[PDB]
Amino acid sequence: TYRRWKLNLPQMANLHRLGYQLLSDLRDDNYFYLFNDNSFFTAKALNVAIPGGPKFEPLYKDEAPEMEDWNEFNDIYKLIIRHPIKTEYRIAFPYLYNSRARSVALSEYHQPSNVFVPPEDPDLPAFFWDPIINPITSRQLTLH
Amino acid sequence: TSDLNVPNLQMFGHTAEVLVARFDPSGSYFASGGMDRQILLWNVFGDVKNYGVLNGCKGAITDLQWSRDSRVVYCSSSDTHLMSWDAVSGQKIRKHKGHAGVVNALDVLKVELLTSVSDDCTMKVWDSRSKDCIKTIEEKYPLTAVAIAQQGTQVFIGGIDGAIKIWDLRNNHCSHVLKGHKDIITSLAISKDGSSLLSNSMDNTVRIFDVKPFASAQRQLQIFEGAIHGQEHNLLGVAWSRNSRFVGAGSSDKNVYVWSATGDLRYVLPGHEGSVNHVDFHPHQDIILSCSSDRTIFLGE
Amino acid sequence: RLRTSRTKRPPDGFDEIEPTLIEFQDRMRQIENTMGKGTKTEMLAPIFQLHHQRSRYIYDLYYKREAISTELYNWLLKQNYADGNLIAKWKKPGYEKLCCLRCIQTAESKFGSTCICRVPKSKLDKDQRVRCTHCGCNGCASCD
Amino acid sequence: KAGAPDLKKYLDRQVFVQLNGSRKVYGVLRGYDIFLNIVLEDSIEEKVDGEKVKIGSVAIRGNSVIMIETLDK
Amino acid sequence: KRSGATKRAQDVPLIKHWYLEHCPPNQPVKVRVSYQKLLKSHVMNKLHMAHPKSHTNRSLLRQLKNTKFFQSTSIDWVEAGLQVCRQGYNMLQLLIHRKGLTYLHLDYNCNLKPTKTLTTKERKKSRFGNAFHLMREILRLTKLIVDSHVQYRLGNIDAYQLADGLHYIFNHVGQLTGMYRYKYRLMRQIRACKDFKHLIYYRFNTGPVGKGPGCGFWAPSWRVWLFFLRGIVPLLERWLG
Amino acid sequence: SLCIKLLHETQGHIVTMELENGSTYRGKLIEAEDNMNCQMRDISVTARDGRVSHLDQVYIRGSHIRFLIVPDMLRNAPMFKVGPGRSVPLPTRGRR
Amino acid sequence: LTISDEAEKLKKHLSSFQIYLKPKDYLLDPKPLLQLICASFFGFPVGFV
Amino acid sequence: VMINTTRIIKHAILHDMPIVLVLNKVDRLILELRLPPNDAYHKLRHVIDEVNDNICQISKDLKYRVSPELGNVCFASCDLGYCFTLSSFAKLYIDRHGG
Amino acid sequence: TTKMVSLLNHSLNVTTKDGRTFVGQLLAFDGFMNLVLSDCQEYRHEEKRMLGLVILRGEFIVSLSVQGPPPMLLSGPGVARPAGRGIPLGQAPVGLA
Amino acid sequence: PLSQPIIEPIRHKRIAIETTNVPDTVYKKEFLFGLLTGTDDVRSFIVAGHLHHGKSALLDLLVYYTHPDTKPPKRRSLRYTDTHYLERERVMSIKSTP
RNA sequence: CGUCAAAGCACUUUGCAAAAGCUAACGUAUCUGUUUCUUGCCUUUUACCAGAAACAGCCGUUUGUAAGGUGUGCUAAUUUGACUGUAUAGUUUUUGUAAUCU
Ligand SMILES: O=P(O)(O)O[C@H]1[C@@H](OP(=O)(O)O)[C@@H](OP(=O)(O)O)[C@@H](OP(=O)(O)O)[C@@H](OP(=O)(O)O)[C@H]1OP(=O)(O)O
Ligand SMILES: Nc1nc2c(ncn2[C@@H]2O[C@H](COP(=O)(O)OP(=O)(O)OP(=O)(O)O)[C@@H](O)[C@H]2O)c(=O)[nH]1
Ligand SMILES: [Mg+2]
Ligand SMILES: [Mg+2]
Ligand SMILES: [Zn+2]
Ligand SMILES: [Zn+2]
C-alpha cells in the first residue's frame, strides 16, 4: 500500500545529492521578510503592492469624500516631515503606520539566523574550525 | 396484572437470530444474545431501554447465564470459549478456554462454579477464576444441554444418545440415567427447589423428571405434546416458573407453550415470525419471556 | 509481466520452461482472436480454461514434481505467470480440482450459492449434469 | 554504590563524638572515610564519672559513631 | 526526515520554491510577470484555507467494485489508455446515433464534421450542448496523450522526443484541443501552464543549451491539468447525467 | 527510593527521630543523605528516662535511626515511579 | 551517536546506562530521537532547580 | 550577550538582585556551528566572561559573580531538553560509578 | 516482590525489633523494607499516642499485617415498542411447507 | 447600514489560550498549596534575557515534565506561557505571564 | 535487555463510525459550483471578468472498529501494554553484640 516509508542515512544522503538541482538553499526563513504569506494578506487588505509580489482588487472601496472634510488632522500644516512613509512600513507594522487597518494579518517577527555552512569537501572532519568564524579574542574586559 | 406499562411489549434489536434471553435472578434486568455476537442488557420496568452492549465475543452467543450477584455475566460462545462479562462496567474479566468445539450450553452454581458442554463430546467444570477446567467428563457423542443442582453435587447432561445422565462430581459413579427420550435433548432446566428436572427433546415430547435420591421407578412424572421442533435442529429451551407450578417451552411453529405442570395445556399463545428459541418466566411477577429466531423478543403478562 | 532484453534475468530454472509458457501465450492469443459460436458469456470460457491450465502447470512443476526452485516459483507468482489465489485454493482440502475463482464466489450468483460444478455428482441428478456457464467446467468436485 | 558523607564543614573544628556504650570523645576532626571512619587529633576522653583524660590521636571506626556534634554558636 | 507518508505523485510540486522566493534578476518582462502570477495564485490558495470537514470515507470505485457488474485485473497503462479512448469514442458515436444524426461524422480524432450540406432543420437538430462538446474535447486531449505514448511504444520516437511532446501537449492545450470554447474558465489553467513554461524554459535554456525543442520537464503542467480535472469531474458528471 | 525521597522532602522542617538508644531528637533537619545520615539544629534531646537536654549542631549517622516523625503536610508529596537505572525518583518524560 | 545512524553502538551504550528503547524508536526522525535520548539520559533538569 | 542582556544585567545588579545564568542553545555549538570541543569551551568561557564584565561595570563586589564552579551557571539546550550544571554531571557520574 | 506492592494504601500493624507496634496507612515502601506510614499510632506496653507521618527503618521492622481493605458502560441499539401478537392461520414448522 | 445585523449573532471574544478546566499535573494541587502557604520552599524569580534567546523554552522544559498531558506542537515550539493570540501570531512574547 | 499479563502474528480487501478545544498543516498539496453583493467587458442570453460573504461538491489523508483473504504458526511465532527490575555474609538496612537478669 505505500503509506509510510523509512530510509537509511546513506540512502537519504544519496537522494539529497541526486536531486540537488530542485531544492532551495536558504534554511533561514528570514529571507522571506516582507515576501511571506501574511505580508501578502496584509498587502491585499491594504491594497498596496510589494513591487515583486501579486496585485489584487481593493477589497475596500469605501473611500469617497462622504465626510467631505480633511478633518484638520492629517494636514501638512501640523506635521513634521522627516522621511516618506513607504508601504513597507505599512506592511511591517500594519496597526501603527496606517489607520483603517482591517483584515490585515501579522507575520512572524524574526527567527534565529542559521549559522550552518555545508562542508565543501568530505576530507575535512565533521567538527572543524571554519576560517569565516571570527576568532575568540576579547582582551577588552574588566572582570572581578 | 403486573407492573409493566403495557401488557405486551415487543422488543426490537439485534441484526441476526437471537438464541438466548434470561431474566436477572433479582427480576429487574435481563440480557439477550444471538448470532450477532452481541449481548444486550434491558430494563424490565421503566423505559425498557438499552444501557449496555457486551461487545468483544468472537462467535455466536449460544447461551449466557446471570450471576447471583447480578453483576457479572457468563457467556457461551460458538468460538470454543467462555467469557465472563462484568455487567456494570462491560469489560472482559476472563476468557475460559479448553473445549474443542462449539460449546452448546452453560450453567452457574449457588456457591462461583461454571459447567458447559460442547461438540467435542465433553463437559467441563470451571471455577470463576481458575481459567482452567477443574474436572472433565468425556462422552461418546456430542452433548447439548446441562443443568446443575443448586445443592452442588449433581449435573445433568443431555446429548445425542437421548438418555439424561446424572453425574456426581465427587463420586464419579454414573450408574443412574433418566431414560425415556428417543432423540436429541435440546434443553434441561431444574426447579427452584431442585427437586424436578424439565427436559425438551427433538422427538417433540417435553417430559418432566424428578431429582430425588429415591424414586418409585418410572421417574417420569408426565409428558407434554404440542411443542414441536422443526428441521433446523435448533436448541429450544424449557423454563420453570417462580412458584414452579407452570412449565414452559418454545417450538418451531412460532407458538409459546405454557402448561400447568399437571398435564393440561394452558397458554398456546402465538406471536413470533420464526422458531422460538428460548423461553423464561420472571422470578417475581407473572411475566413470560419469549426468544425467537426472527430478531425479536416478547415480554409477557 | 512483459520482459525486455535489458531486464533482470529470471532465475536459473526459467529457460527450461520458457517455450511451453510461450506456447501458452500463443494459444491465449488464438482464443482472443477466435470469435463466434456462443452466447455473450459462452465465448469467454476458453480463457478461463487456458488460465487454469497454465497455473496448474506451474503448480505441478513446483508441488508435485519439484522441478523448479522456490525462488523461481515465487518469481513466477510475482510476474503473474500463475494465479496466486487459485493456487492457494488448490492447496487446501476440498478444492484440489477447482476450475476458477468465479465458481466459488457466492456474491456473483443470483441466490448466493456457489456454481453447479462444485456439487459432487453423486448428489446431483442425471439431467442437471451440464457444463458450467462461467467457464464450461464439467465438475470441480474433488470426489469426481 | 556507596556515597561520600558530607563533612567538609566539620573539618578542623572542635567536635564531640558519641560512641556506642555511652562513650564520649572530644577532638578536632582531621579526616573521614566512606564508612564514616573518622580521625581525631589532640582529643580528650570522658568517662561516666566525668574526669577528663587526654586520649591523643584517635581513629574511630565509623560503625560505632552514634553522633558527631559541634558546640560553636 | 528519514520517515514520511508517501504523498501522491501530483501532490509534489517540485518547483514551488522557485517562485515563492524572489525573481532572479535580469529576467525578461514576461518571466517576471509569470513569477508574480504564480505567486498570486498561491497566495489566493492559502488565503481561502478551509480546515477540512469531517466525513466518512466514501469512494466511487469501491462501491462499483462491490457490484457483480465490475471486475478487476492488471494491464499495461498504454492498453488501458487505448481502451479508454475507444470506449469514449463508442459512447459518443452511440449518442450521435439514437438521435438520427447519422450524417454527422465523429472521426477518430473526435472532430464532429457533417458528411453533407445540412438544411436549417438538420442544422438546428444537430446542435449539441456544452456538455457533449466539453466531453468530446477532453476525450481529444486524452487521445493526444495516449497517441504520443503509442508512438513511443512503436519505436517511432525515443524517450526524449516523447517527454518533449508531452510537455508540448500540456502547455499547448489551447491550440491543440479548443476545449476553452465550451468552458472559458479553463483560461486560468492555460495561463498557469504558460507561466510554468516561462519559468522552466528560462531555468532550462541557460549556458550551452539554447533555444529550441527539447525541454521535457512536464510534471508541473501535468499536475495543473490534473487539478483542473478534479474540479471539473463532478460538473461533467452532473451535466452528462 | 521513595522513603529516602520523603526524608529529603523533610529538609528544612522540624522532624523528631529516635535512635537505637531510645532518645528522641526535636530539631530542624538541614541535610539528609541516601544513607540517612542527618544534620540537625536547635535539638532538644529527650533521653530514655525523660531527662531533657539541648544540643545545637549534630550529625547523626544513619545506621542508628529507628524512625522519624515527618511533618503532617508531607502526606501529599508525590510518589514518582522509578525506572531501573534511575537512582532518584523524579518526574519522567522519556520511555520509562 | 544519536545523529550518525549507529543503531547497535547506541543501543549497547544505552544498555550500559540501563536506558532501554523500543526497537521502533531507533527508527525515528533525528530530532525526536535526540529529544528521547536526552530525556532518558538527563532526567528532570535538576541542575537548574 | 546582546544589548537587552546588558540592560537586564545592569538593572538587576543596580537593584541588588542575585543572578543565575543559563547558557541556552548549547546544541547549536555541536550540530549547527560544528565547533570542536575545545573551541566550544572557549566560546562558553568567553560568554561567561562578557556577562561578568557587564556585572562588574556596576559593582565590583564579589557577591555578584557568575561562574560554573560556584554552581551559578547552567548549560542548557531547552529544545533538546536538558539543563545541567557542573554538579549535575558530577552527580550523574557518581551515581553510576560509586562513592 | 509484586505482593509487596499490594499492601499500599492499606492499614498495617508492624511489630518492631524494639517490641512496639505501629498502626497506620502504608504510603510507600523500599527495597530495604523502609515503610512510610500515615496517621500512625504507637502501641507501647497498650497506650495510644498519635504520631502522624512516620518513616520506619528497615532494621526496626520485624513483621507486618493488614487490618483493612483499601479505601475508595455506554449505550445500546435496541428500542422497545408495545405491540400485540398476530395469530397466523397456519400450523406447520418453518422448514416444512 | 446594511452591515448591522437585526439579530446580533452570539460572539465570544476569546483573547488568550485559557483551558476550561484545570489540567492534571504530576503533583497534587493540595501539595502545591501547602508548599506555598506553610513552607520556605518557595522561590520567586523572573526569567529574562534578549530576544529569542530561549527563556520561554526554559519554562516549557519544566512544564513538559510537570504536565504529562501537554504534547509538543506540530510545526513550532510549544511556547507555553504566551497565551495571547497576538503573541502566537508574532511568535514572540509581549506580556509577562506568571 | 529482564519479569509478568493477553493477543496468534505479518501483509491485505471491504463495510460502519469519527476526525481543531488549550489558535491550529486531517492535505507542507490544491480544483469546481450555487446564492447574495460590488466590479470589468459589454446590443440580448449562455459563456464570461475579479474581489467579498454565506454555503456546498469533488480529488485525497488519518484513526477506531467489524467481517474476511494470502503466507506462515499453534509440538510456537510475533505484537501490544504494564512493571517499586539486578548483584552482594566482611562497618549505612536482609546471613545478627548475642544470650544472661530486671
Ligand atoms: O509562446 P511563448 O511562451 O512566447 O514562447 C514562444 C514559443 O512558443 P509557441 O510556439 O507557442 O509560440 C516557443 O516555445 P515552445 O513553443 O517551444 O514551447 C519558444 O521557446 P524556445 O525558444 O525556448 O523553444 C519561444 O520562447 P523563448 O523565446 O522565450 O524561448 C517563443 O517565445 P516568443 O513568443 O517570445 O518568441
Ligand atoms: N536549536 C535550538 N533552538 C532553540 C533552543 N531553545 C530554544 N530554541 C528556539 O529558539 C526560538 C525562540 O524560543 P523562545 O522560547 O520563543 O525564546 P523566547 O526567549 O521566549 O523569545 P522571546 O519571548 O521573544 O524573548 C524558538 O525557535 C525555539 O525553538 C535550543 O536549545 N536549541
Ligand atoms: Mg518568551
Ligand atoms: Mg430576445
Ligand atoms: Zn469456474
Ligand atoms: Zn461453475
Ligand SMILES: [Zn+2]
Ligand atoms: Zn467448475
